[PDB]
């Protein structure tokens, strides 16, 4: 479900390390597309 | 570009901590669609 899986990728995305470029950037794109609906 | 994107894929998919299971589901899902074309 959106509404609790928008702050795990929160809590993922604010936690991984940002040598990760990619999963960061998936991480930060998937929080766009909840957060914009 | 899709050719060297995806060992980039890979690389951060197989490094990342399991702990990030949408991190790492993510990272998973991207692979697929570049492995699949």
Same mark, same amino acid.
């Given at each position: !479900? =959106?509404?609790?899986? /928008?702050p795990? /990728?929160?809590?993922?995305? @604010?936690? /991984? @390390? !940002?040598?990760?470029?990619? %999963?960061?950037? /998936?991480?930060? %794109? =998937? $929080? =766009?597309? $909840?957060?914009?609906?």
């Amino acid at each position: !479900p =959106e509404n609790k899986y /928008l702050p795990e /990728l929160m809590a993922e995305k @604010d936690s /991984l @390390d !940002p040598s990760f470029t990619h %999963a960061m950037q /998936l991480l930060t %794109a =998937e $929080i =766009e597309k $909840i957060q914009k609906g």
